């Protein structure tokens, strides 16, 4: 009721600070990406379009700032009530589609490292068109409504009944197309990334154990340090053979263990000098069959060193963390619209926490630039 006025008077100032922070940071991001990076990779095109969508949304943000400040007294008219809400919904849809495409591109780049810039631009245009199409409900049904006989006007959503089933659809098309289907694609594209990293790390971790113990054999001539070092090498050779990133990889390690078994043979008798001679041959086998598969493991793990992967992970994680309040509360509204819940408290919590969730959901719009300078060590110099 009127008690909510005290908290809600601070909503417009949060909108204003978000607007200024975003309109500065995302503009800087645009100029940085276009100039110091020159859009030389596919990951740059998607991020630049994310920044452009942020610009487009933040341009129409201050209308809602005064709309909440004036306590729902939208004066800008119908031609802006039908475009500001459209801009908000389009921002949501375009941002989530761009994030899904970014995650798919990261998976393809670090799991399948095999002109795509033009393909990126085409996909970007398709994403913008699809987001504009999904913003059609705000294009059509959003309309200025005169409250009572007074002169108060609100950018109300006109559920014209007896010709529309949408009330169920709109609350669900957001929760499905804007958060659910994108989540499955992104989670799948990042679980597959983890599997490819785990296989690459296992080969690198086990081959390290071969390297350190190989150094131990040369430096020690105790006739038992060779046994201890060789035993840990054979166990590492077997483990690395199972870290599949086909016959060449298996045949490459079958000979490798055979040399360790040969070296372990004379370590038993006491021929220390002959022990490291057989262990020295391990380098020859490595350079032939294993080094080819050893560079890919480091190359794949080197993609985590890229600042792009750090930035995209931060952007994707925050977007779905900040949208989990509103998307959950949106589903609650959908259930309450069909009569599933008939609780005053449920209706009250949905109708009073939703103002905060919208601010929370679009809070990420002014935090995308802050993820560039925080994790983009290169971006700091710009």
């Amino acid at each position, epitope marked *: 009721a009127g008690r909510h006025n005290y908290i809600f008077v601070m909503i417009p100032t949060l909108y204003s600070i978000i607007f200024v922070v975003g309109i500065f940071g995302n503009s800087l991001v645009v100029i940085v990406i276009y100039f110091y990076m020159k859009l030389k990779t596919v990951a740059s095109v998607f991020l630049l379009n994310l920044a452009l969508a942020d610009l487009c949304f933040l341009l129409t943000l201050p209308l809602w700032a005064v709309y909440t400040a004036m306590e729902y007294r939208w004066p800008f008219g119908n031609y802006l009530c039908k475009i500001a809400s459209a801009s908000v919904s389009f921002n949501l849809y375009a941002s989530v589609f761009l994030l899904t495409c970014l995650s798919i591109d990261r998976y393809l780049a670090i799991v399948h490292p095999m002109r795509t810039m033009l393909v990126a631009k085409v996909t970007c245009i398709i994403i913008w068109l699809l987001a504009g199409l999904a913003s059609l409900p705000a294009i059509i049904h959003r309309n200025v409504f005169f409250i009572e006989n007074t002169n108060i006007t609100v950018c109300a959503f006109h559920y014209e009944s007896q010709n529309s089933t949408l009330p169920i659809g709109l609350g669900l098309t957001k929760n499905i197309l804007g958060f659910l289907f994108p989540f499955l694609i992104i989670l799948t594209s990042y679980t597959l990334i983890w599997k490819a990293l785990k296989k690459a790390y296992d080969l690198e971790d086990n081959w390290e154990t071969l390297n350190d113990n190989l150094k131990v054999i040369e430096k020690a001539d105790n006739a038992a340090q060779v046994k201890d070092a060789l035993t840990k090498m054979r166990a590492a050779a077997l483990d690395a053979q199972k870290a599949t990133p086909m016959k060449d990889f298996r045949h490459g390690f079958d000979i490798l263990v055979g040399q360790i*078994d040969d070296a*372990l043979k004379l370590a038993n008798e006491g021929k220390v000098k002959e022990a490291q001679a057989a262990a020295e041959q391990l380098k020859t086998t490595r350079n032939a069959y294993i080094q080819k598969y050893l560079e890919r493991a480091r190359s794949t793990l080197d993609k985590l060193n890229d600042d792009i992967f750090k930035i995209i992970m931060a952007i994707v994680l925050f977007f779905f963390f900040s949208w989990i309040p509103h998307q959950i509360f949106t589903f609650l509204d959908v259930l309450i619209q069909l009569g599933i819940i008939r609780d005053c408290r449920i209706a009250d919590i949905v109708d009073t926490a939703m103002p905060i969730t919208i601010c929370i959901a679009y809070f990420n719009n002014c935090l995308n630039p802050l993820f560039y300078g925080f994790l983009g060590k290169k971006f700091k110099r710009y």
Partner: antibody
Amino acid sequence: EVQLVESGGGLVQPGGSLRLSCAASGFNVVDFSLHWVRQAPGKGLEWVAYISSSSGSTSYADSVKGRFTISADTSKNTAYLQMNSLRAEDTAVYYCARWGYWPGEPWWKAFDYWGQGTLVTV
Amino acid sequence: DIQMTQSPSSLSASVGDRVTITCRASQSVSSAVAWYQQKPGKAPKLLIYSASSLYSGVPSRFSGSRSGTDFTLTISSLQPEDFATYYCQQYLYYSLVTFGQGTKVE
């Protein structure tokens, strides 16, 4: 089918000698390693020694190294083991087992076919 | 000298129960762990080689898994014939063979 049969068991005073022989059938010693696993009465299994006929290799347990002499004969498809300077701990049921060579799967199968087992008392 | 330790000294269970035996190795032995089953008065029989692969001619009750250095043997249904001493084994190298201590399911 592939089977392993032991022999040479008996009763002897400590410090005696026995000729525990591990005969093989079905397979050949030239493509398998004939180990020797023993367990004291009521105790767990303990490794003793092995022969690599193809590679001419041999090894022994730490409590057995320098005590028993092992050998193999591929002509008769049988293994051998010599007991020297027996002790009270040496009494056990001696199982001869077979184990494949590293290149391929037969290595991963461990001791897949064990012998019938022979009893040695001191 | 990889020491192999078996946790359940003497597992007690009834017919139809699902039993597990846990094996821990001193060092890392990769997946080179085999499981045996010594009925009393008879030679041991191999059940699971490579710590996860069932042997030929063995009922599918026995299933083995490896979690780093932790090797476990699982019997889905404890039939009355599966009452014997189960022995761990690690076979990283020919001269590095060390067995467990024995878990007799009673």
